[PDB]
Design a protein around this ligand. Structure first.
Ligand SMILES: *[C@@H]1O[C@H](CO)[C@@H](O)[C@H](O)[C@H]1NC(C)=O
Ligand SMILES: *[C@@H]1O[C@H](CO)[C@@H](O)[C@H](O)[C@H]1NC(C)=O
Ligand SMILES: *[C@@H]1O[C@H](CO)[C@@H](O)[C@H](O)[C@H]1NC(C)=O
Lengths: 181, 190
């Protein structure tokens, strides 16, 4: 028996089916969501045989203001600083949250304010380069991490272990002031 | 200031406060028709008419695709871990690599090993190591398929034999030797 074996962007063949493959199949998968319509059609040989993972998505964003400066589980946790933003979402595929992740500049701010800095203790996260920022979105705790030092806004999910490479979190505005670590 | 519907594919569909300089709302519909594929994307956003040519024009990259395939005949043996094209296809494993300039690109497919036709050449096959994996008890003759019509040997400071495309044979160097007539990569011919 010979069937059309054709994927989109795969090998499209006239195929001699294997012994025990007594059927030709054509399948049409259609998908409708907001601002997307997709139709795939595959053909192949098949046989009547009688007889769950997790998804992880991550956004990382860096902003800058100078000229041409951009050149070169079931839970979510993010950290968003004032220069860089990192969010990580993880779901069980049976019941998954496909809601999008918004970049830093689109998150509404939450009212929290935290100090922000990056780099080594003495330079980069001195209290000369450390400045207060408004937190945005779900990152409503103030975070310090050291292992080098980073400060910013964080979600509670990112504060709960706090282990090496250690993190400290606190729930009140300004609480990550540099000589309070 | 201006506010537009901002909607992406699989993304954040918002009502957006546009930037001061953004005087336009954009709606964009991209449609794609290929053999056995139809796609429609709709993205809405804020935009601005930027006048003449934007500074220091544009760029054009390279697209590179690689297929790697392993077969086995044993029971649940695929459990897990446990500007041109060149391929090598062995008897167990197949690796092909295609490279194109996006302006003139060959979107032709890469076919798995079992669907490529035999080309008539036959070469020896083994991988891994002299004592184990490329003994001449573990070295077998195989029919080559598709564009892989050369017999290849390679070794490094590990050894593999198989069928190879001329693209994979045109220089040595971790050393490679190729030959064009059947059986010529026999271990007693190195
Ligand atoms: C996902 O959730 C279902 C119940 O909702 C459970 O039976 C299944 O084992 C879960 N899978 C994973 C990978 O957590
Ligand atoms: C691609 O090829 C065209 C001519 O075929 C050439 O003008 C162009 O510069 C090439 N681009 C790259 C990135 O190689
Ligand atoms: C070949 O067998 C294993 C690798 O599969 C390795 O331990 C062994 O040392 C190799 N033989 C020689 C002579 O290196």
């Amino acid at each position: 028996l010979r069937c059309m074996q054709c994927k989109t962007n795969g090998d499209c063949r006239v195929e001699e089916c294997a012994l025990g493959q007594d059927l030709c199949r054509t399948t049409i998968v259609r998908l409708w969501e907001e601002g997307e319509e997709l139709e795939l059609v595959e053909k192949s040989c098949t046989h009547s045989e009688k007889t769950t993972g997790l998804k992880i998505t991550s956004l990382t964003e860096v902003v800058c203001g100078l000229d041409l400066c951009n050149q070169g589980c079931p839970g979510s946790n993010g950290f968003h600083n004032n220069d860089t933003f990192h969010f990580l979402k993880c779901c069980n595929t049976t019941k998954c949250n496909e809601g999008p992740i918004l970049e830093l500049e689109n998150l509404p701010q939450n009212g929290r304010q935290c100090y922000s800095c990056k780099g080594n203790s003495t330079h980069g996260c001195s209290s000369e380069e450390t400045f207060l920022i408004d937190c945005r979105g779900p990152m409503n705790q103030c975070l310090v991490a050291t292992g080098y030092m980073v400060r910013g806004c964080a979600t509670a999910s990112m504060c709960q272990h706090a282990h090496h490479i250690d993190v400290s979190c606190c729930t009140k505005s300004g609480c990550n002031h540099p000589d309070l670590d």
